[PDB]
């Protein structure tokens, strides 16, 4: 599929209660691999994957410096925006940013982006063309006009086309071993008797990575999702994931109902009956 290097940045003001809390989190193919956290004894960019320990002290010191500088820049943005929106200094507010490039198997840039959001709302975003800006409201037009006639489109494009892409390739070579990791789901079915004739068959799926999975319930090779119940794919907390689906079925007909598990880790989908 399409590989991605994305950086997730949050600055949260704490008026009275010290300086704003700042945090960057880096992702390679939607897997956390670096994280900078302002709140810490000694704030440093730290490896979150074991394979990022290959990188020497020159990498970490430079990334830390970048972060410390960004923190101070966002610390202003929070104050700047209070002005644009005629807001109160007492109030706590949140700036979020998603920076990143994604490249094909060929190693070529497919798409780059820089998205800002203030208090959950979309603020300003770098277009597909990496030249123009898109201001969500009137406050965002002030900083569009500013970044236009300051040459920020040129500077970001140089990072997104150049730096982001070159470094993604490096990170993919280093982490390939552990990024290609897939644990296929272990799956059982539990019987739950209901007051009336009806009973609840629950299809379990445990110990699988990554989270991307599909659970379905079939009767006469026909999928019933309308009268089905299933929970959002949740982390086990040991690096694996969990998800169950459950259907309510007439008592004694438990063998006509079949559960099917779809995961990239499985050589083919997995079929299940109440045993």
């Amino acid at each position: 599929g399409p590989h991605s290097l994305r950086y997730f940045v949050t600055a949260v003001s704490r008026p009275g209660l010290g300086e704003p809390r700042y945090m960057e989190v880096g992702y390679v193919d939607d897997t956390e691999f670096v994280r900078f956290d302002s709140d810490a004894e000694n704030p440093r960019y730290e490896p979150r994957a074991r394979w990022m320990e290959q990188e020497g002290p020159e990498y970490w010191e430079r990334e830390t410096q970048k972060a410390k500088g960004n923190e101070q820049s966002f610390r202003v943005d929070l104050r700047t925006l209070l002005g644009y929106y005629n807001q109160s200094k007492g109030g706590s507010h949140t700036i979020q940013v998603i920076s990143g490039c994604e490249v094909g198997s060929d190693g070529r840039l497919l798409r780059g982006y820089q998205q800002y959001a203030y208090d959950g709302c979309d603020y300003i975003a770098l277009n597909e063309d990496l030249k123009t800006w898109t201001a969500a409201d009137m406050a965002a037009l002030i900083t569009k006009h500013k970044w236009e006639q300051a040459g920020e489109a040129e500077r970001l494009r140089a990072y997104l086309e150049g730096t982001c892409v070159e470094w993604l390739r490096r990170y993919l070579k280093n982490g390939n071993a552990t990024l290609l990791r897939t644990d296929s789901p272990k799956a059982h079915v539990t019987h739950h008797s209901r007051p009336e004739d009806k009973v609840t068959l629950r299809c379990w799926a445990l110990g699988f990575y990554p989270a991307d999975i599909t659970l379905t319930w079939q009767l006469n090779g026909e999928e019933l999702i309308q009268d089905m119940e299933l929970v959002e794919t949740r982390p086990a907390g040991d690096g694996t994931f969990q998800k169950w689906a459950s259907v309510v079925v007439p008592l004694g007909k438990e063998q006509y109902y079949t559960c099917h598990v779809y995961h990239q880790g499985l050589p083919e989908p997995l079929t299940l009956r109440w045993e």
Partner: peptide, 10 residues
């Protein structure tokens, strides 16, 4: 390697 907000406030 992260984007450098090189003191370019909004």
């Amino acid at each position: 390697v992260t984007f450098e907000k090189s003191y370019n406030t909004v």
